[PDB]
């Protein structure tokens, strides 16, 4: 029974925490010497692209309120906290010649020491879509392959400064989303894809550059730091369970496996065997870059653990110039015969399907043979309602049930022999939600935008504390 | 012609200025020992009643940022600034026994010395709807005639603490809107009359108590302070020009006179003659309270000057249990034949009718014989649009035309013989617009809610500085 | 013999301590954003009701001087300190929508870390009569059963913020005195029942709501916090030993049982059996509210331990519109023949009867079967005398004898089989004594009201340190 699930259902080394990302929570966008990211420029030059015409300038000010956030995490009582570093905060010109920003570095050391002073293990993510505008304007950010070198300098800087305290690193979080919405749909920064953009090619380049960035940085950590710092490095991928519309149509079973390949295979096959997946080569063909064999040699096996981000699920079936969206040759369906795959959440794109996480997990271990996994994101948003008062606003029953159901399923995947080491809820705080602006609330901690971002736990947080404290 | 209007069109002693009110700009709702006002409880207990479900806990933070507001005022170059004191900031329990708050007194004293250091004359308003919650809760606030004594204590504090430097006082601003929307429509705080409220009776009592509070405070100033401090005291009234829908229908002409009577005569006749206006006794009859004869002697001529707030105008015609709304027996028309009385501002209720201000002024002078008038409010709101970048956003041509046409008409009124002494635009800053929340902008100074309320002048501010500097 | 009593007469796990309550010591009534409690309004609106016409605006200033109180506690050497949180300090509008006050939370967190730095265990009391004025004014406070929900929000805040370090909680202290003197005699705040009050009904409702607030808060702790924080929760009851005026009159014996029933059974039977005591239903009958059966299921056994506050004792005999006072049908006798039950303290209502505490303890164990008890209050007041210099003033032999005799009797009770876990003297400091104002001194630490509340130990403090140090 899911409602009874608690810490003692898990092995003792199991890790529990929460998560944020720098641009969604920090604010202090032009403070302490930070330079502009592509999200800074996107939200300020294309306000029409954001619900409310808002931006992350202040966000929820974890830049100035990080001490409260740490006190929150100490009360919450979980093992670990996952956050990301703002590239253009530590290097405002993105590359070394641009300046090294001591104040930015001091911020993260203050963050990291606060966490450890309180027994909370930091899990740090080098990159979460916030590309320094300077690198974007000079050579097209991740379009160009120069990005690998700059990224590598940025990475080395973080390892040298923080690697004595941070022992768990991730190069990238959710690169899929950065590629697709950055360059295919043009909904996220830099906002490209109808030169003005091209959903047929750019996404594939960008992803190509992301993966070399990731593999270069892991070679760096592994050759220069790991022996002396003794940490571990890995990466974090967007996932979504893909169900065959018709369990029978062996052709649907195929539209589903293809939908995987194009989402998760696109990143996981490279770091597994040094190459993209067949289906992708087949359907993309010559628009899809190749790896030199030293590149493959570098990618193949570039990680100590993998993190999976899981929210939702879908039915897949087959489809009927060029674009990533169409290259997949599938159609997405939400119901079989009038029945949705699961109930809606506050967000119409998000259907609740706890069994999906069990599946995605088992699939991953089976298809790619990963020996160590973390779930690095999993959570749900609140129904929008500016009408509720706080005692109402905080009873977040759906989220609570969502957490218990997904955590129960993770536990099942383990029984199936998937070696999962921890689970992190998304997100710690309500925060900036990219194109959605401040309207969507994923926090286990509630935030009051009308009164300096006062923070208050929701019942999910009290429940996490009480059920998983240690 | 209007666009050429400048300070040299007016006499040398004429005064130009801008204005705000405490709850709309201050924030710092619970800082520096402020107690809660009825606007605090309303916005927090009934967020459904506010666009966005927002409140003025932070507002545009003038509580902390006033040094900046003062600098803006010094740059703007106008003679004067009109602001109001938050009753429950200085007396957080509303009455003396509730505690005198030194820190809130220190705040206004800093504001005031700050303005005086810069050559800016302070015009101060004791009351702008922000009734101390403690008084509302103890005896129903302006429902009870207890309010007259408490209001007097409050006023005497202010004169004692500030009267050495403030020389221009106003007891109430726009009492009309308070009565009507507080007690007839129930749209504003305390949100009554949509016991529980009675649109037929409460508005008339509230208004009755407002006027006695005003007259008691004026007797107090004049008997106990005027000789030593040598200030001047007055009051500010909502007004709207009322136009006969059909200039020919002597019946329409009268509906228009009656509509004035119930808006402006309701407050003006008592301080002129000691009594309510004839038409209101007729149509409201026995539901309309009466003044003892010593009350009338206190009310009559209880002011050194009067201010009028003008925004818009209207066509009036005759109408075909009880409520203030129906007691007027008029109907409101904008169109005289699908021909609107004037164009829309960014608000559909505000229609631009510059000659309105000229007429209201001339009417007030003739009907009530006021020897000295200020226009204490006048302004317009920008079209909403979260899509513009600041360079576009600050180009506020409508407002700029609006100001010149209205200021031009004020000049006319002075030619017509009205003694107008000054004119304040509304408002200085974009701010909390009551039930409209933050979505409506009246400022000559733009505000960026996304970036700690950064202030930036709009072309109207620039124009006012350039044409009226001194 | 009593005078030789020392820590080595007790088991090793036995706990000694001292205590205060928030409104009696803190002061800082309007500092750090505290909101007003009913004791604030009562003392300020009805000063005639307080000896001297004084209030606890400053009290003995522990709000500012707590570092000093902490040092005193470290010097005193006892295991524990019992204090209470001021509801309206943490939530100045009493309910969440009223604002969460960080600064009041920071205050208790400093107090608490301060005590823990010094090896002193904090025992914390959520409620000690200081009802937020905002709640009293909105819906009559503990008159309404709304209070149960608000009280629960409050309690959950406290457990979330402090429960990582506070491991010993109490929901209410001395609810009896609150009901009776708040609502029957009208002597204490809110001062009712001497509408307007009704000694016949309100006390019974107040008490009814107190017990539901207590039981809701305990269910909350036990279901949402206990597992993660591992604390313990309980409650503290007023008690007085009731002695049969004539040991022979079986009728007197019963008046005594009935007098207990109406003081202690009134609170104790509900948390023991789910219901009021038999005798109270009989004599109060239909005026006594009833528990739905889920209420009784929540109440029954709703505590981890119970504390008893004992001061004095009394002889009871039978008595010959309605009020709590008369419903008891008993009369109180001190003299058994011009032979007083014991000598006077500095207060004529307090008569020294050490075996009282032994009997009350044994009775509680037998009648209600509590497995775990603390004596949470016990102390005596000095003879008034503004004539003594400090060297004389601090020689408090009566108190010192009083403590030894009572502590001796506690030891007896443990021989008699009662499981007493600790004992706290009352109070640490001389302080605000409610209707008695400052004229009455219960402190083991003297206070000099003439010289910023300088603290100085009295011989009893010295003795307690010397005999009970650890
Ligand atoms: Cl370089
Ligand atoms: Cl008073
Ligand atoms: Cl609430």
PDB file of N, CA, C and O in Angstrom, chain B residues 413-460:
ATOM      1  N   UNK B 413     -10.455  77.558 -16.623  1.00  0.00           N
ATOM      2  CA  UNK B 413     -11.249  77.765 -15.415  1.00  0.00           C
ATOM      3  C   UNK B 413     -10.786  78.994 -14.638  1.00  0.00           C
ATOM      4  O   UNK B 413     -11.600  79.724 -14.057  1.00  0.00           O
ATOM      5  N   UNK B 414      -9.477  79.236 -14.643  1.00  0.00           N
ATOM      6  CA  UNK B 414      -8.944  80.411 -13.974  1.00  0.00           C
ATOM      7  C   UNK B 414      -9.320  81.641 -14.769  1.00  0.00           C
ATOM      8  O   UNK B 414      -9.599  82.687 -14.199  1.00  0.00           O
ATOM      9  N   UNK B 415      -9.340  81.533 -16.090  1.00  0.00           N
ATOM     10  CA  UNK B 415      -9.872  82.653 -16.870  1.00  0.00           C
ATOM     11  C   UNK B 415     -11.350  82.868 -16.573  1.00  0.00           C
ATOM     12  O   UNK B 415     -11.808  84.000 -16.468  1.00  0.00           O
ATOM     13  N   UNK B 416     -12.086  81.772 -16.438  1.00  0.00           N
ATOM     14  CA  UNK B 416     -13.490  81.833 -16.056  1.00  0.00           C
ATOM     15  C   UNK B 416     -13.710  82.394 -14.665  1.00  0.00           C
ATOM     16  O   UNK B 416     -14.847  82.585 -14.270  1.00  0.00           O
ATOM     17  N   UNK B 417     -12.641  82.623 -13.906  1.00  0.00           N
ATOM     18  CA  UNK B 417     -12.773  83.291 -12.616  1.00  0.00           C
ATOM     19  C   UNK B 417     -12.506  82.405 -11.414  1.00  0.00           C
ATOM     20  O   UNK B 417     -12.527  82.875 -10.283  1.00  0.00           O
ATOM     21  N   UNK B 418     -12.255  81.119 -11.630  1.00  0.00           N
ATOM     22  CA  UNK B 418     -12.015  80.242 -10.496  1.00  0.00           C
ATOM     23  C   UNK B 418     -10.595  80.412  -9.936  1.00  0.00           C
ATOM     24  O   UNK B 418      -9.626  80.423 -10.685  1.00  0.00           O
ATOM     25  N   UNK B 419     -10.483  80.532  -8.620  1.00  0.00           N
ATOM     26  CA  UNK B 419      -9.201  80.683  -7.957  1.00  0.00           C
ATOM     27  C   UNK B 419      -8.572  79.328  -7.693  1.00  0.00           C
ATOM     28  O   UNK B 419      -8.745  78.759  -6.620  1.00  0.00           O
ATOM     29  N   UNK B 420      -7.855  78.803  -8.678  1.00  0.00           N
ATOM     30  CA  UNK B 420      -7.163  77.534  -8.521  1.00  0.00           C
ATOM     31  C   UNK B 420      -5.720  77.830  -8.133  1.00  0.00           C
ATOM     32  O   UNK B 420      -5.074  78.670  -8.750  1.00  0.00           O
ATOM     33  N   UNK B 421      -5.230  77.164  -7.092  1.00  0.00           N
ATOM     34  CA  UNK B 421      -3.919  77.495  -6.532  1.00  0.00           C
ATOM     35  C   UNK B 421      -2.844  76.505  -6.915  1.00  0.00           C
ATOM     36  O   UNK B 421      -1.668  76.780  -6.772  1.00  0.00           O
ATOM     37  N   UNK B 422      -3.249  75.348  -7.396  1.00  0.00           N
ATOM     38  CA  UNK B 422      -2.286  74.339  -7.706  1.00  0.00           C
ATOM     39  C   UNK B 422      -2.988  73.173  -8.334  1.00  0.00           C
ATOM     40  O   UNK B 422      -4.220  73.167  -8.437  1.00  0.00           O
ATOM     41  N   UNK B 423      -2.200  72.180  -8.719  1.00  0.00           N
ATOM     42  CA  UNK B 423      -2.646  71.083  -9.522  1.00  0.00           C
ATOM     43  C   UNK B 423      -1.685  69.951  -9.261  1.00  0.00           C
ATOM     44  O   UNK B 423      -0.493  70.127  -9.470  1.00  0.00           O
ATOM     45  N   UNK B 424      -2.162  68.795  -8.816  1.00  0.00           N
ATOM     46  CA  UNK B 424      -1.303  67.647  -8.673  1.00  0.00           C
ATOM     47  C   UNK B 424      -1.731  66.507  -9.597  1.00  0.00           C
ATOM     48  O   UNK B 424      -2.919  66.138  -9.625  1.00  0.00           O
ATOM     49  N   UNK B 425      -0.778  65.911 -10.319  1.00  0.00           N
ATOM     50  CA  UNK B 425      -1.105  64.782 -11.147  1.00  0.00           C
ATOM     51  C   UNK B 425      -1.184  63.548 -10.296  1.00  0.00           C
ATOM     52  O   UNK B 425      -0.583  63.475  -9.221  1.00  0.00           O
ATOM     53  N   UNK B 426      -1.879  62.539 -10.807  1.00  0.00           N
ATOM     54  CA  UNK B 426      -1.980  61.311 -10.109  1.00  0.00           C
ATOM     55  C   UNK B 426      -1.612  60.250 -11.106  1.00  0.00           C
ATOM     56  O   UNK B 426      -2.043  60.335 -12.249  1.00  0.00           O
ATOM     57  N   UNK B 427      -0.765  59.308 -10.722  1.00  0.00           N
ATOM     58  CA  UNK B 427       0.054  59.381  -9.522  1.00  0.00           C
ATOM     59  C   UNK B 427       1.555  59.595  -9.849  1.00  0.00           C
ATOM     60  O   UNK B 427       1.879  59.681 -10.974  1.00  0.00           O
ATOM     61  N   UNK B 428       2.438  59.671  -8.852  1.00  0.00           N
ATOM     62  CA  UNK B 428       3.887  59.751  -9.088  1.00  0.00           C
ATOM     63  C   UNK B 428       4.332  58.449  -9.686  1.00  0.00           C
ATOM     64  O   UNK B 428       4.964  58.425 -10.758  1.00  0.00           O
ATOM     65  N   UNK B 429       3.951  57.363  -9.020  1.00  0.00           N
ATOM     66  CA  UNK B 429       4.454  56.053  -9.348  1.00  0.00           C
ATOM     67  C   UNK B 429       3.327  55.137  -9.811  1.00  0.00           C
ATOM     68  O   UNK B 429       2.194  55.328  -9.414  1.00  0.00           O
ATOM     69  N   UNK B 430       3.630  54.134 -10.627  1.00  0.00           N
ATOM     70  CA  UNK B 430       2.698  53.063 -10.807  1.00  0.00           C
ATOM     71  C   UNK B 430       2.641  52.451  -9.441  1.00  0.00           C
ATOM     72  O   UNK B 430       3.692  52.379  -8.756  1.00  0.00           O
ATOM     73  N   UNK B 431       1.454  51.958  -9.053  1.00  0.00           N
ATOM     74  CA  UNK B 431       1.243  51.331  -7.727  1.00  0.00           C
ATOM     75  C   UNK B 431      -0.005  50.422  -7.560  1.00  0.00           C
ATOM     76  O   UNK B 431      -0.716  50.144  -8.527  1.00  0.00           O
ATOM     77  N   UNK B 432      -0.210  49.909  -6.339  1.00  0.00           N
ATOM     78  CA  UNK B 432      -1.386  49.085  -6.002  1.00  0.00           C
ATOM     79  C   UNK B 432      -2.688  49.839  -6.348  1.00  0.00           C
ATOM     80  O   UNK B 432      -2.891  50.983  -5.948  1.00  0.00           O
ATOM     81  N   UNK B 433      -3.515  49.267  -7.215  1.00  0.00           N
ATOM     82  CA  UNK B 433      -4.724  50.032  -7.633  1.00  0.00           C
ATOM     83  C   UNK B 433      -5.972  49.304  -7.090  1.00  0.00           C
ATOM     84  O   UNK B 433      -6.869  48.872  -7.825  1.00  0.00           O
ATOM     85  N   UNK B 434      -5.917  49.044  -5.795  1.00  0.00           N
ATOM     86  CA  UNK B 434      -7.040  48.540  -5.054  1.00  0.00           C
ATOM     87  C   UNK B 434      -7.591  47.233  -5.612  1.00  0.00           C
ATOM     88  O   UNK B 434      -6.923  46.207  -5.533  1.00  0.00           O
ATOM     89  N   UNK B 435      -8.811  47.226  -6.157  1.00  0.00           N
ATOM     90  CA  UNK B 435      -9.380  45.950  -6.641  1.00  0.00           C
ATOM     91  C   UNK B 435      -8.730  45.501  -7.933  1.00  0.00           C
ATOM     92  O   UNK B 435      -8.650  44.309  -8.238  1.00  0.00           O
ATOM     93  N   UNK B 436      -8.236  46.479  -8.688  1.00  0.00           N
ATOM     94  CA  UNK B 436      -7.428  46.206  -9.893  1.00  0.00           C
ATOM     95  C   UNK B 436      -6.040  45.618  -9.659  1.00  0.00           C
ATOM     96  O   UNK B 436      -5.365  45.292 -10.630  1.00  0.00           O
ATOM     97  N   UNK B 437      -5.593  45.515  -8.402  1.00  0.00           N
ATOM     98  CA  UNK B 437      -4.227  45.015  -8.084  1.00  0.00           C
ATOM     99  C   UNK B 437      -3.092  45.768  -8.792  1.00  0.00           C
ATOM    100  O   UNK B 437      -3.085  46.998  -8.817  1.00  0.00           O
ATOM    101  N   UNK B 438      -2.148  45.044  -9.393  1.00  0.00           N
ATOM    102  CA  UNK B 438      -0.980  45.740 -10.030  1.00  0.00           C
ATOM    103  C   UNK B 438      -1.121  46.000 -11.534  1.00  0.00           C
ATOM    104  O   UNK B 438      -0.383  46.814 -12.105  1.00  0.00           O
ATOM    105  N   UNK B 439      -2.138  45.374 -12.141  1.00  0.00           N
ATOM    106  CA  UNK B 439      -2.394  45.450 -13.578  1.00  0.00           C
ATOM    107  C   UNK B 439      -2.741  46.805 -14.135  1.00  0.00           C
ATOM    108  O   UNK B 439      -2.854  46.958 -15.332  1.00  0.00           O
ATOM    109  N   UNK B 440      -2.886  47.818 -13.305  1.00  0.00           N
ATOM    110  CA  UNK B 440      -3.276  49.122 -13.829  1.00  0.00           C
ATOM    111  C   UNK B 440      -2.270  50.226 -13.398  1.00  0.00           C
ATOM    112  O   UNK B 440      -2.003  50.394 -12.204  1.00  0.00           O
ATOM    113  N   UNK B 441      -1.769  51.008 -14.355  1.00  0.00           N
ATOM    114  CA  UNK B 441      -0.643  51.906 -14.148  1.00  0.00           C
ATOM    115  C   UNK B 441      -1.027  53.315 -14.324  1.00  0.00           C
ATOM    116  O   UNK B 441      -1.246  53.741 -15.447  1.00  0.00           O
ATOM    117  N   UNK B 442      -1.013  54.085 -13.255  1.00  0.00           N
ATOM    118  CA  UNK B 442      -1.303  55.498 -13.340  1.00  0.00           C
ATOM    119  C   UNK B 442      -0.083  56.370 -13.220  1.00  0.00           C
ATOM    120  O   UNK B 442      -0.193  57.605 -13.258  1.00  0.00           O
ATOM    121  N   UNK B 443       1.081  55.745 -13.026  1.00  0.00           N
ATOM    122  CA  UNK B 443       2.285  56.537 -12.717  1.00  0.00           C
ATOM    123  C   UNK B 443       2.804  57.396 -13.852  1.00  0.00           C
ATOM    124  O   UNK B 443       2.800  56.975 -15.025  1.00  0.00           O
ATOM    125  N   UNK B 444       3.275  58.595 -13.530  1.00  0.00           N
ATOM    126  CA  UNK B 444       4.224  59.212 -14.451  1.00  0.00           C
ATOM    127  C   UNK B 444       5.634  58.592 -14.372  1.00  0.00           C
ATOM    128  O   UNK B 444       6.454  58.919 -15.192  1.00  0.00           O
ATOM    129  N   UNK B 445       5.876  57.673 -13.433  1.00  0.00           N
ATOM    130  CA  UNK B 445       7.138  56.990 -13.268  1.00  0.00           C
ATOM    131  C   UNK B 445       6.858  55.514 -13.375  1.00  0.00           C
ATOM    132  O   UNK B 445       6.106  54.958 -12.571  1.00  0.00           O
ATOM    133  N   UNK B 446       7.497  54.842 -14.336  1.00  0.00           N
ATOM    134  CA  UNK B 446       7.235  53.443 -14.574  1.00  0.00           C
ATOM    135  C   UNK B 446       7.802  52.624 -13.447  1.00  0.00           C
ATOM    136  O   UNK B 446       8.726  53.085 -12.798  1.00  0.00           O
ATOM    137  N   UNK B 447       7.347  51.384 -13.252  1.00  0.00           N
ATOM    138  CA  UNK B 447       7.837  50.577 -12.181  1.00  0.00           C
ATOM    139  C   UNK B 447       8.028  49.215 -12.730  1.00  0.00           C
ATOM    140  O   UNK B 447       7.152  48.711 -13.443  1.00  0.00           O
ATOM    141  N   UNK B 448       9.109  48.538 -12.357  1.00  0.00           N
ATOM    142  CA  UNK B 448       9.350  47.246 -12.909  1.00  0.00           C
ATOM    143  C   UNK B 448       9.206  46.223 -11.817  1.00  0.00           C
ATOM    144  O   UNK B 448      10.126  45.996 -10.997  1.00  0.00           O
ATOM    145  N   UNK B 449       8.037  45.578 -11.815  1.00  0.00           N
ATOM    146  CA  UNK B 449       7.659  44.643 -10.789  1.00  0.00           C
ATOM    147  C   UNK B 449       8.493  43.444 -10.906  1.00  0.00           C
ATOM    148  O   UNK B 449       8.448  42.600 -10.022  1.00  0.00           O
ATOM    149  N   UNK B 450       9.227  43.305 -12.001  1.00  0.00           N
ATOM    150  CA  UNK B 450      10.004  42.074 -12.147  1.00  0.00           C
ATOM    151  C   UNK B 450      11.409  42.209 -11.491  1.00  0.00           C
ATOM    152  O   UNK B 450      12.076  41.222 -11.230  1.00  0.00           O
ATOM    153  N   UNK B 451      11.807  43.450 -11.236  1.00  0.00           N
ATOM    154  CA  UNK B 451      13.166  43.819 -10.776  1.00  0.00           C
ATOM    155  C   UNK B 451      13.150  44.829  -9.626  1.00  0.00           C
ATOM    156  O   UNK B 451      13.377  46.024  -9.834  1.00  0.00           O
ATOM    157  N   UNK B 452      12.824  44.340  -8.431  1.00  0.00           N
ATOM    158  CA  UNK B 452      12.627  45.168  -7.245  1.00  0.00           C
ATOM    159  C   UNK B 452      12.070  46.535  -7.448  1.00  0.00           C
ATOM    160  O   UNK B 452      12.593  47.471  -6.832  1.00  0.00           O
ATOM    161  N   UNK B 453      11.037  46.690  -8.261  1.00  0.00           N
ATOM    162  CA  UNK B 453      10.375  47.965  -8.335  1.00  0.00           C
ATOM    163  C   UNK B 453      11.246  49.074  -8.805  1.00  0.00           C
ATOM    164  O   UNK B 453      11.051  50.224  -8.393  1.00  0.00           O
ATOM    165  N   UNK B 454      12.152  48.773  -9.748  1.00  0.00           N
ATOM    166  CA  UNK B 454      13.024  49.841 -10.314  1.00  0.00           C
ATOM    167  C   UNK B 454      12.125  50.862 -10.888  1.00  0.00           C
ATOM    168  O   UNK B 454      11.152  50.502 -11.522  1.00  0.00           O
ATOM    169  N   UNK B 455      12.453  52.121 -10.668  1.00  0.00           N
ATOM    170  CA  UNK B 455      11.731  53.281 -11.127  1.00  0.00           C
ATOM    171  C   UNK B 455      12.394  53.844 -12.408  1.00  0.00           C
ATOM    172  O   UNK B 455      13.626  53.890 -12.492  1.00  0.00           O
ATOM    173  N   UNK B 456      11.600  54.361 -13.343  1.00  0.00           N
ATOM    174  CA  UNK B 456      12.113  54.964 -14.555  1.00  0.00           C
ATOM    175  C   UNK B 456      11.092  55.955 -15.075  1.00  0.00           C
ATOM    176  O   UNK B 456       9.963  55.600 -15.264  1.00  0.00           O
ATOM    177  N   UNK B 457      11.489  57.199 -15.346  1.00  0.00           N
ATOM    178  CA  UNK B 457      10.482  58.138 -15.825  1.00  0.00           C
ATOM    179  C   UNK B 457       9.960  57.818 -17.241  1.00  0.00           C
ATOM    180  O   UNK B 457      10.671  57.218 -18.065  1.00  0.00           O
ATOM    181  N   UNK B 458       8.722  58.252 -17.503  1.00  0.00           N
ATOM    182  CA  UNK B 458       8.012  58.024 -18.747  1.00  0.00           C
ATOM    183  C   UNK B 458       8.073  59.376 -19.382  1.00  0.00           C
ATOM    184  O   UNK B 458       8.442  60.352 -18.698  1.00  0.00           O
ATOM    185  N   UNK B 459       7.703  59.500 -20.654  1.00  0.00           N
ATOM    186  CA  UNK B 459       7.821  60.810 -21.292  1.00  0.00           C
ATOM    187  C   UNK B 459       7.027  61.865 -20.614  1.00  0.00           C
ATOM    188  O   UNK B 459       7.306  63.053 -20.808  1.00  0.00           O
ATOM    189  N   UNK B 460       5.989  61.488 -19.859  1.00  0.00           N
ATOM    190  CA  UNK B 460       5.142  62.547 -19.245  1.00  0.00           C
ATOM    191  C   UNK B 460       5.889  63.221 -18.137  1.00  0.00           C
ATOM    192  O   UNK B 460       5.821  64.448 -17.977  1.00  0.00           O
TER     193      UNK B 460
END
